[PDB]
Amino acid sequence: MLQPKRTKFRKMHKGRNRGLAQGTDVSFGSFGLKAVGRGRLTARQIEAARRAMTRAVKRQGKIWIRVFPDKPITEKPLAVRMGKGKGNVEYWVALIQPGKVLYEMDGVPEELAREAFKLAAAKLPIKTTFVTKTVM
Amino acid sequence: GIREKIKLVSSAGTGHFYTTTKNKRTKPEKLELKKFDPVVRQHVIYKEAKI
Amino acid sequence: AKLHDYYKDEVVKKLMTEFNYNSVMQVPRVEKITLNMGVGEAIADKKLLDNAAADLAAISGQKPLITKARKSVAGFKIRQGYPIGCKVTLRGERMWEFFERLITIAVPRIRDFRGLSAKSFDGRGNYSMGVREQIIFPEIDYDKVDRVRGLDITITTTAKSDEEGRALLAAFDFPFR
Amino acid sequence: MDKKSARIRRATRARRKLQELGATRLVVHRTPRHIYAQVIAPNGSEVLVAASTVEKAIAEQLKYTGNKDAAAAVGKAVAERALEKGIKDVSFDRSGFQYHGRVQALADAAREAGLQF
Amino acid sequence: TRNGRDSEAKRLGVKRFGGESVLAGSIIVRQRGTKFHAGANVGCGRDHTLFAKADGKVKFEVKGPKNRKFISIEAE
RNA sequence: CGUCGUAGUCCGGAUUGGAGUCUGCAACUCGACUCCAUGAAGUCGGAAUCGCUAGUAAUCGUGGAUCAGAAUGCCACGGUG
RNA sequence: CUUACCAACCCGAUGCAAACUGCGAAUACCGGAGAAUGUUAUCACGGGAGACACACGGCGGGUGCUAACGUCCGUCGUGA
RNA sequence: CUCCUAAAGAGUAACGGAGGAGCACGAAGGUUGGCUAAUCCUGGUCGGACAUCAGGAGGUUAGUGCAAUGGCAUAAGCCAGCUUGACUGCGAGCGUGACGGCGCGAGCAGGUGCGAAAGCAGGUCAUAGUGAUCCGGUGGUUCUGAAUGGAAGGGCCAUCG
RNA sequence: UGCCUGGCGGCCGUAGCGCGGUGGUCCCACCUGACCCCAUGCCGAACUCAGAAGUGAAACGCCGUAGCGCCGAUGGUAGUGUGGGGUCUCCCCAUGCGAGAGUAGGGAACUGCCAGGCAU
RNA sequence: GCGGGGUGGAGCAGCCUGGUAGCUCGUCGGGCUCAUAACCCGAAGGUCGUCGGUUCAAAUCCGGCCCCCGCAACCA
């Protein structure tokens, strides 16, 4: 599970998730999984989708993970009233905007990359699409 | 909370005095300064005394 | 000013053609000789550092400059600002009258002499070497010796490379192993 | 580290203060061979009077053009050149040089010649 | 451990903006450092408060080789 | 008779380097001895413990057996005592 | 000596930040000038108060689960 | 007290997110003169990853009595000389508070320090280091003094709990 | 009037850095000497004084050069005031404002006062 | 939910007040004994639960994580 090794602060504001994404094109590999929806990606979802793609291509070629869950999310335990300070950090998320490229793959045929990305997309809470590297 | 309050009495006949602090552990020597005495309107020397 | 006079007349015109200099100002020079004595152990007692600097005062006839610790480091357990060692820099003819005093007296005295190294150059044309014994100088008498502390000697030259650097001291007949 | 740039750093503070005070300053520049003197307007861009040893009108009457008594000649000259021009009170700008020796000999000579500073 | 502390706001910032006419002694800007520097007819207090040393209109300029912001009084 | 004059020394001799001698078919493992050089620990020894009653203890040399060579061991002898 | 691996700095490429900024709006705010419009709508002093339990909606946020007809601020509107 | 939340003037809540203070200093204050870091590389007696020396790179990544922020090269950082302006009376004009208050302040008078001089100095780079009133203490005082002269007590000024 | 140098400014990177070249009559720099004025918490290095044998090596100035920095449109995009709308954690429409980054490109500063030298 | 604790093999100091690791037992070598215990002489073993920070310097001071024993969980 991806997680920052250390942070300047432990807890962060909720914030908002407006706007479109940066890094909207395949920059390392040849095929990419681009998010068309908006939402959060927990570190477990990222790891689950990575394993689904890693096993799909039988550990072949190269795989990049363009996102990183750097935002901590706190929760209050059960049977606890409101107040008495912010909750404890439970997991980390990466904010996703439409157009964000999540994963990139290289070294495999396209027809195999589509199935690998299709298996991984089933683990993610946001709608995605298949993209390929283009001549800028 | 170590600095004690002291007073500097004018060497002139007037009873005028200033007040200041002093760390009597590191500086056991008496403090002597030239300060303005508003009674005689001159700069005389002021010597230390107990508050 | 023996080698000083020997500098401006002999070693300039052999070097002027050795490197084919256009101006005489291109020939390297010798700015200063600075003698460092890192005591290090004076923190235990400082009575030994004054007489330690008393030796360095007799080697060059100049009152030494006591160096202080630039920063606190516990690896040698000293706090910043402690008197840690003395040094003397020599310029002008006092450098020269000392510069011959070792090359003609400081060379033929060191125990098991084998010659100086040609690799002990800074990389931009400045030489530095350390003598281990202080009883090698005529000034310091053997009778009066409380310790056998050495010292470092570095040669500051206007040379730009080590080749021009080694060429200059070679002109003064420096022992190069 | 050139000695010049290290000297402008020494002269920057006093020049800022004189500029803030709106005073007409007497700038002094000293070289190993010559000595110079200028009286600058309070705005710092107009030279009212000037005198130096590179002017042959003053250089011919000196044994050497860069010693202490040569500076006294420029100090005397720049003051009488400014008195008739109308300036009487100025501020001495040593301009990074120590107020000692030649620049000091230039100052008191101008002070002796009737320039109030 | 536990948060919940803060200090009273100090009401810093610019008090008289560009073009405003001020009397001598009027405070122009309160600041912690010298974010703004004193120009002509402007003093710098011990807490780096910039105050007008003469009547006139305040003027903001950026000058010098470090592009520092200066405040001066156009005496009128 | 001279010297050393209380010091790790003109005490102490370990260890090591170089050069050799002899025995022996053969001195590498693994001999004894010589010369030059070097000069460890050691400044009288904790708990404890041993021998000795008179030509004894202590100390000083000498010889023999075994043995080509290889004794600080063993067995014997006398000097001082 | 070459060797399951980890790897600083630097260089190239790619992201992230309420407590990052070599950039930087819209608005808002302060000041000046100018018309038109507004029953002085402004300020000062004096007489009399009431009120100091707010609610929801929009926008910007903290908090909570971007849960609550939740909670806590900013601002506007309506109810009061 | 400092930062964020705070929505680019000010201000702005929560048992919201992070840290500090209840001092220190007669020099760590004033002034004049001077000075410029961190880190790393190379070379060099003991000496080592790390001491002092020399050179280059580097350019403030350092430093600031202490938290954070804003500042700081003209340095507000570092060093030395001489010093007491860590002055007395005031104070145009502002800032900030419901108020009590708190803050900034050119200039004026008296006297003083440093500087050749222009000048600078009414504590410290700035923002925390604090406690109203009553009662009482101590010193001073061309104030008052219950018939009068004194005194007690009170007032005023300085200061303490 | 032109060239060149020095001083003081304006301006504050289109002005900086690098690379290459170049300059000594004057100027400047290094330089020479140092008992003395003065100076080194040691050192005439620096500061200071007395000088003019040497040199433009360094430094500084100048010239060239697009290696880097720097400047930088147009268009689009993001955001956003007001009004309206939706599938309302986010958007869309009308209208006004309109970046940042990046791209084309620009770019090896410009200028005032005074002084000296040289040509004129 | 609040208090105290973790350091040679075992049991405990030092921490408060930063620089310097103590005690008793045990273990190891040597003695006494015919032999063992007791006893006598000497010696070894901790880098302080961890990671992180403050400091020139951390067992010692401050944060977090692991653990260990405690106290509290009240009115319906």
Residues 6+ apart with CB under 8 A from C16: C24, C27
Task: Report the number of distinct structural domains present in chain D.
Answer: 1
The CA distance from A75 to A79, in Å, is 12
Segment holding E60, helix H or strand E: strand E56-63
Residues 6+ apart with CB under 8 A from D1: none
CB C6 within 8 Å of CB C166? no
Going by the DSSP 8-state scheme, the letter that residue B29 receives in this structure is: S
**Cβ of D111 near strand I (distance < 7 A):** no
Checking each nucleotide's C1' against the CA of A10, the nearest proves to be H17
Domain that holds residue C98: 1-177
From residue D82, give the alpha-carbon distance in Å to each of D25, D57, D86: 12, 16, 6
CB C39 within 8 Å of CB C85? yes
Resolution (A): 2.5
**Cβ of A14 near strand G (distance < 7 A):** yes
The CA distance from D89 to C118, in Å, is 65
Which tokens is C176 given? 């190069």
The CA distance from C165 to D33, in Å, is 34
Which tokens is D82 given? 């400014």
Going by the DSSP 8-state scheme, the letter that residue D114 receives in this structure is: T
Question: What is the residue extent of each domain of chain B?
Answer: 1-51
Residue with tokens 């974010």: E35
How many Å apart are A14 CA and G51 C1'? 37
Phi, psi at E63, each rounded to 5°: -140, -175
CATH topology of domain E13-74: OB fold (Dihydrolipoamide Acetyltransferase, E2P) (2.40.50)
Checking each nucleotide's C1' against the CA of B33, the nearest proves to be H84
Contacts of D among chains (3+ CB pairs under 8 A): none
**Beta strands A128-132 and C65-68, pairing class:** unpaired
How many Å apart are A79 CA and F11 C1'? 92
The CA distance from C99 to C34, in Å, is 11
Residue with tokens 């100025």: D90
How many Å apart are A133 CA and J62 C1'? 53
Checking each nucleotide's C1' against the CA of A39, the nearest proves to be I89
Side-chain-facing half-sphere of A76: CA atoms under 13 Å: 9
Segment holding B5, helix H or strand E: strand B4-10
**DSSP calls for chain A:** ----S--S-S--------S--S--S--SSSEEEEE-S-EEEEHHHHHHHHHHHHHHTTS-SEEEE-----EEEEEPPTT--S-SS--EEEEEEEEE-TT-EEEEEESS-HHHHHHHHHHHHTTSSS-EEEEE----
Classify D82 as helix, strand or coil.
Answer: helix
Residue with tokens 């005198």: D51
Question: Could you give the maximum distance between any two Cα atoms of chain A, in Å?
Answer: 56
**Residue A1 falls within a domain, yes or no?**
no
**Cβ of E50 near strand H (distance < 7 A):** no
- Of the candidates A108, A110, A100, the one whose C-alpha atom is nearest the C-alpha of residue A132 is A110
Closest protein CA to C1' of nucleotide I55, residue = C25
Q: How far is CA C153 from the centre of its chain?
A: 2
The CA distance from E14 to E49, in Å, is 10
- Residues 93-132 of chain C with CB under 7 A from strand J are none
Side chain identity, residue A94: A
CB A112 within 8 Å of CB A31? no
- Of the candidates D15, D8, D17, D40, the one whose C-alpha atom is nearest the C-alpha of residue E38 is D17
Side chain identity, residue A24: T
Domain that holds residue A54: 21-136
- Of the candidates D37, D64, E53, the one whose C-alpha atom is nearest the C-alpha of residue E44 is E53
CB D55 within 8 Å of CB D40? no
Closest protein CA to C1' of nucleotide G61, residue = A15
CB C127 within 8 Å of CB C119? no
The CATH code of the domain that includes A119 is: 3.90.1170.10
CB D28 within 8 Å of CB D94? yes
CB C109 within 8 Å of CB C134? no
The CA distance from B10 to B37, in Å, is 7
The CA distance from C86 to C51, in Å, is 11
User: How many residues belong to chain E?
Assistant: 76
Checking each nucleotide's C1' against the CA of A7, the nearest proves to be G17
Phi-psi region of D44 (alpha: psi -120 to 50; beta: other; left: phi over 0): left
Task: Report the number of distinct structural domains present in chain A.
Answer: 1
CB D25 within 8 Å of CB D37? no
How many Å apart are C32 CA and F62 C1'? 78
Checking each nucleotide's C1' against the CA of E8, the nearest proves to be H1
Which tokens is B3 given? 């600095």
- Residues 60-119 of chain A with CB under 7 A from strand G are 66-68, 70-71, 74-76, 82-83, 86-87, 95
Query: Hey, what long-range contacts does E49-52 have (CB within 8 A, 24 or more apart)?
Result: E51/E25, E51/E26, E51/E27, E52/E16, E52/E22, E52/E23, E52/E24, E52/E25, E52/E26, E52/E28
The CA distance from A84 to A74, in Å, is 14
Phi-psi region of C113 (alpha: psi -120 to 50; beta: other; left: phi over 0): beta
The CA distance from D85 to D83, in Å, is 5
The CA distance from D51 to D57, in Å, is 10
Contacts of C among chains (3+ CB pairs under 8 A): none
**Cβ of D25 near strand H (distance < 7 A):** no
The CA distance from C72 to C78, in Å, is 6
Side chain identity, residue A65: I
Contacts of E among chains (3+ CB pairs under 8 A): none
Q: How far is CA C140 from the centre of its chain?
A: 17
- Residues 99-118 of chain C with CB under 7 A from strand H are 117
The CATH code of the domain that includes C169 is: 3.30.1440.10
The CA distance from C52 to C68, in Å, is 15
CB B17 within 8 Å of CB B5? no
Task: Report the number of distinct structural domains present in chain C.
Answer: 1
Closest protein CA to C1' of nucleotide I79, residue = A19
- Report the structure determination method: cryo-EM
Contacts of B among chains (3+ CB pairs under 8 A): none
How many Å apart are C73 CA and F64 C1'? 76
Nucleotides of J under 7 A from a protein CB: 19, 55-57, 63-64
Domain that holds residue D90: 1-117
CB C40 within 8 Å of CB C69? no
Question: What is the residue extent of each domain of chain E?
Answer: 13-74
**DSSP calls for chain C:** -HHHHHIIIIIHHHHHHHTT-SSGGGS--EEEEEEEEE--GGGT-SHHHHHHHHHHHHHHSS--EEEE-SS-BGGGTB-TT-EEEEEEEEEHHHHHHHHHHHHTTTTTTSTT---B-SS-B-SSS-EEEEES-STTSSSS-SSS-S----EEEEEEE--SSHHHHHHHHHHTT--B-
The CA distance from B17 to E9, in Å, is 38
Which tokens is D56 given? 């042959």
